[PDB]
Amino acid sequence: KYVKVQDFYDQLGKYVLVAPGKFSGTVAATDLSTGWTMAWLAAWNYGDTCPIMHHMAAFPSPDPYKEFEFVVNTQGGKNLFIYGVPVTVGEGMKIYRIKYDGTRMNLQRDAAEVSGLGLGVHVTITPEADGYAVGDGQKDICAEFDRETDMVRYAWAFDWDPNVKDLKRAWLDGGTMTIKRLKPTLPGGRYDLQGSKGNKIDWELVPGGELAIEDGKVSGDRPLHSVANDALVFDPRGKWAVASMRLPGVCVVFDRENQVPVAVLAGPKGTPSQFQLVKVDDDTWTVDIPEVISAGHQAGFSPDGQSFLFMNSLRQNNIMVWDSSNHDDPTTWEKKAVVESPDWRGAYPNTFHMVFTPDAKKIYVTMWWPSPTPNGIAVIDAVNWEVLKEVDLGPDMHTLAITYDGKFVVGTLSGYQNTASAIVVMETETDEVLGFLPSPMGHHDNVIVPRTLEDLRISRSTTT
Amino acid sequence: KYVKVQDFYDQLGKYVLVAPGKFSGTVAATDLSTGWTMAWLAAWNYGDTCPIMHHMAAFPSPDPYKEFEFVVNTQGGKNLFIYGVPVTVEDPGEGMKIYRIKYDGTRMNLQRDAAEVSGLGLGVHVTITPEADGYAVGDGQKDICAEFDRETDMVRYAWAFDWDPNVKDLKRAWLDGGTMTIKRLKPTLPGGRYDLQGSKGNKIDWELVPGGELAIEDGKVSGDRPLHSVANDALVFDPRGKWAVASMRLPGVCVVFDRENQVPVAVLAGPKGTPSQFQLVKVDDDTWTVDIPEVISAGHQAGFSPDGQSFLFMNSLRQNNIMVWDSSNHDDPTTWEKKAVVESPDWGAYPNTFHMVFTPDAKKIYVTMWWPSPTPNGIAVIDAVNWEVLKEVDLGPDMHTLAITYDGKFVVGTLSGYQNTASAIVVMETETDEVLGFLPSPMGHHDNVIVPRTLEDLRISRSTTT
Ligand SMILES: [Cu+2]
Ligand SMILES: [Cu+2]
Ligand SMILES: [Cu+2]
Ligand SMILES: [Cu+2]
Ligand SMILES: [Cu+2]
Ligand SMILES: [Cu+2]
Ligand SMILES: [Cu+2]
Ligand SMILES: [Cu+2]
Ligand SMILES: [Cu+2]
Ligand SMILES: [Cu+2]
Ligand SMILES: [Cu+2]
Ligand SMILES: [Cu+2]
Ligand SMILES: [Cu+2]
Ligand SMILES: [Cu+2]
Ligand SMILES: [Cu+2]
């Protein structure tokens, strides 16, 4: 007579959802098979004073219900003032290490404290699970870190040198981006880059962002020199990592072990496949970009690593795909398809998160707009590189994760920090929305805890 | 062939849940007909220094999807060190804020701290007046309660309470009895305002915990005046109007008050094998006393059936039961006689039974069964016509409040993981009392409400019970 919600959870299998809350200041893991919050943690409790918990990634655990670790970072400073919240008040850029122990979440350490390097945007796990990487776009630094020591393996620092020394034309009329090896300054191999240290801009570029800096609405010490770095993502086949740079519309493919950049991929339609990487000294490389056609954002590899994706955003909205089958040489990576839609012609929507099915035949991609247009999810034919369908969901759509058996896509909507928020679930057989679960959180990220190294091919490792 | 969770919600109705988060420092509204959080707020975002969001009560609105308003308080100080979380801030904000918050159909807005308006900060239960024309808050660290005007946030009246133990050692301070003083608390600053914000007036440094009466007796509760505590909890209202009843955990008595004339009228004695009442004696225009010979159990949960004929006060700890008064004589609460106890062979020291909700017809009540970790907590279903336990169901760690859908169809509760482990929203239907399931809830809720539509709704919301 009465409808039981456990009938709903039962289909989804034995999977743990974890998501950070941005302005809520909490991080929260959820049992998708019973509907319980297994545990949550509020950073304010540990003396954090802008706990804007931002991006996160979970390491594989052979049994998440007994134990899992993940990495979650924060933002602070003037990131507080960006959204709808009439705030009346900490630099953020903390890299917290946290273990769920079968019962509670336990803060283990701040790794930006250990390493000396604080970084505010995407967190990713290595394909080996022996490390993680973070990027930040206020400092324009990404680094891989060791799992065991929380020390930096390599860090890279990026600078824009505009052709036109004015914020309106700084990117459009092109210029030169410098790829620089960033080395420690402090005793014991530590950096002096915690919190604010080394910010070029006093807050992260939000969506629609590149215009705000162009038009001068974004203060800081060096905005003419921003490239806004977002993510360092991983080739699921090892060796390579790719740093995405939002403003000049490029990714750089780094060699992981040899600690060198190897290819610079060009994002927009109307550019070749790659630009031309140019060694200056041992620590320094450059790349010429005659004009920037569009700012890009989302990047990621298919889980077999045959395919490599960048989202152009705003000036163009599409998905750029490269042929990445040659594991051997990323200089040989060539454009193979572009994903466009008639519905992508305007300034919005934008496509800033994704997940693949494990068989590499579909992607699911978020579709973002400011209030009030509702946001949603496009389904991508990842073989034919075609839009299959677009379902509208609601306000402020963020990330997408997928249960590892390929069956459900678990997403977050985060209400611009001030309105409706939720977890949406979508089955992947016929892509019907099964519905929404209460998520009183500002999530800009979400994971299902993975069990295996292979699981990470579709977690927060290969894509953001 | 897939189950849609939308079908779960489609049955629930057009109801809107609100719960505060305690150590999560957040408050959220959930739409029970869709799954969505409608909005959430994070107090830290407003320079709140200890955002332990604590008790809440919501005002009726013709359409809560268009607008509702609520009241939410905070705790600060050594309350932070109470739980399993190894908080690291040693010298936290004082809490005792009283937030007025409006949901405008899109978001939550912090209106004002009513405790800054009035000068009177209070940390425990928050309840709405049944004319919905104000609210009340109580507090067991400073043992004061008070009704506020909804429109000015100024105090209508405030009562301080103080204990004078027969035997002046913390072990015997309540068991060997004593005398409680009820004192009219008048404002001492310009603008009709009190000087009682933050930790001001604290007699002990934390609200006593369930089972806590022992911990204070043993000298384990620090503070200025631990011997002079009564641990006031709540000021709940007769839904017929007229009376507010104040609950005192350590003496095991509730004081009935005339809300319009601002005098106490009765003192109801909680424990089995005490009379109905104890003699309320008048000293002067501002001061009453009552002698309690000996205090045989601490009490906690206190409130009224939706029709006002019954008033309940749960003994907790030394006895565990539900004490029930014949409260039908709305003209004269000196005539309120005990008519029944509720017992259970499986009640006690624990479980501790510290929240309740009635059905709108006043036929059943759902009461919380609380234990420390790891004993499963849950809900007991009571027969309120016969005064018997019908059923108990096991749910999970750290059960807290109960609300009910206004058609009377779904009890909706919260479990709060001790601030550190599992937490959820619980749905249970009232026709045959089955547990329909759980909804993620990442908060340490000590309260939750369903936003009422009418004045009649409130009789089964945060107004009559806590
Ligand atoms: Cu982000
Ligand atoms: Cu310059
Ligand atoms: Cu991003
Ligand atoms: Cu190879
Ligand atoms: Cu967004
Ligand atoms: Cu973000
Ligand atoms: Cu996002
Ligand atoms: Cu209903
Ligand atoms: Cu309480
Ligand atoms: Cu004394
Ligand atoms: Cu209470
Ligand atoms: Cu009357
Ligand atoms: Cu509790
Ligand atoms: Cu409670
Ligand atoms: Cu409480």
B415 token code pair = 């479990």
User: B352: exposed, middle or buried (C-beta count within 10 Å: 0-12, 13-18, 19+)?
Assistant: buried
CB A76 within 8 Å of CB A93: yes
DSSP A90: -
User: B252: exposed, middle or buried (C-beta count within 10 Å: 0-12, 13-18, 19+)?
Assistant: buried
User: B231: exposed, middle or buried (C-beta count within 10 Å: 0-12, 13-18, 19+)?
Assistant: buried
Distance CA A398, CA B53 (A): 27
Report which residue type is found at A406.
Answer: G
Distance CA A371, CA A392 (A): 13
CB B404 within 8 Å of CB B386: no
DSSP B190: T
Q: Do A35 and B396 touch (CB under 8 A)?
A: no
Q: Do B440 and A437 touch (CB under 8 A)?
A: yes
Distance CA A52, CA B100 (A): 24
How many secondary structure helices (H) and strands (E) does chain A include?
3, 32
Chain B from 395 to 454: CB within 8 A of any A CB: 396, 417, 420-425, 427, 429, 431, 434, 436-443
Q: Identify residues after which chain B is interrupted (C–N over 2.5 A).
A: 347
* Ramachandran quadrant class, B409 (left: phi over 0; alpha: psi -120 to 50; beta: rest): alpha
Phi, psi (degrees; rounded to nearest 5) at A283: -105, -15
Residue B298: beta bridge partners?
B316
Looking at the partner chain, which of A2, A40, A436 has a beta carbon nearest the beta carbon of B434?
A: A2
Distance CA B238, CA B261 (A): 15
Residue A141: beta bridge partners?
A136, A157
Sign of the C-alpha dihedral computed for residues A343, A345, A346 and A349 taken in this order:
positive
How many secondary structure helices (H) and strands (E) does chain B include?
3, 31
B115 token code pair = 């405790």
Q: Extract the runs of DSSP E, i.e. beta strands, from B223-336.
A: 232-237, 243-248, 253-258, 263-269, 280-284, 287-292, 298-304, 310-316, 321-326
Of A322, A330, A250, A241, nearest in space to A286 by CA: A250
Q: Is B328 annotated as contributing to ligand binding?
A: no
CB B247 within 8 Å of CB B261: no
Of A200, A135, A195, A139, nearest in space to A167 by CA: A200
Distance CA A24, CA A168 (A): 35
- β-strands B52-58, B68-75: how paired? antiparallel
Distance CA A302, CA A309 (A): 8
Chain A from 368 to 397: CB within 8 A of any B CB: 394
Of A57, A29, A23, A59, nearest in space to A43 by CA: A23
Distance CA B221, CA B226 (A): 7
Q: Is B96 helix (H, G, I), strand (E, B) or coil?
A: strand
Q: Tell me how far the alpha carbon of residue A407 is from its chain's centroid.
A: 23
Q: Measuring CA to CA, how many Å separate B209 from each of A48, B83, B138, B205? A: 27, 10, 15, 12
Residue A354: beta bridge partners?
A365
- β-strands A175-181, A229-234: how paired? unpaired
Q: Do B2 and A11 touch (CB under 8 A)?
A: yes
Which residues, at least 6 apart from B91, have a Cβ–Cβ distance to it below 8 Å? Answer: none
Q: Do A425 and B30 touch (CB under 8 A)?
A: no
Tell me the chain B residues in contact with residue A104 when contact means C-beta distances shorter than 8 Å.
Answer: 84, 420-421
Tell me the chain A residues in contact with residue B44 when contact means C-beta distances shorter than 8 Å.
Answer: 25, 44, 51, 89
CB A399 within 8 Å of CB A445: yes
Q: Is B445 annotated as contributing to ligand binding?
A: no
Q: Is A142 helix (H, G, I), strand (E, B) or coil?
A: strand
Q: Is A12 helix (H, G, I), strand (E, B) or coil?
A: helix
Q: How far is the CA of A54 from the centre of ligand 6 (A)?
A: 6
Give the CB-side neighbour count of residue B277, counting CA atoms within 13 A: 17
- Domain range summary for chain A, segments of one domain joined by +: 1-464
SS (HEC) of A162-173 = ECCCCCCCCCCC
Q: Tell me if chain B has a CB within 8 Å of the CB of A86.
A: yes
Q: Choose the mutation target among B72, B116, B421, B439 for the interface with A, i.e. most A CBs under 10 Å.
A: B421
Query: Which secondary-structure segment (H or E) carries A180?
Result: strand A175-181
CB atoms within 10 A of CB A258: 9
Of B161, B130, B129, nearest in space to B145 by CA: B161
CB A430 within 8 Å of CB A264: no
Q: Note the maximum CA span of chain A.
A: 74
Distance CA B60, CA B455 (A): 7
Which residues, at least 6 apart from B261, have a Cβ–Cβ distance to it below 8 Å? Answer: none
Looking at the partner chain, which of A45, A438, A440 has a beta carbon nearest the beta carbon of B26?
A: A440
CB A437 within 8 Å of CB B28: no
Distance CA B161, CA B159 (A): 6
Distance CA B39, CA A414 (A): 10
Distance CA A77, CA B113 (A): 25
**Hey, what's the torsion of the CAs at A4, A420, B395, A37, to 10 degrees?**
110
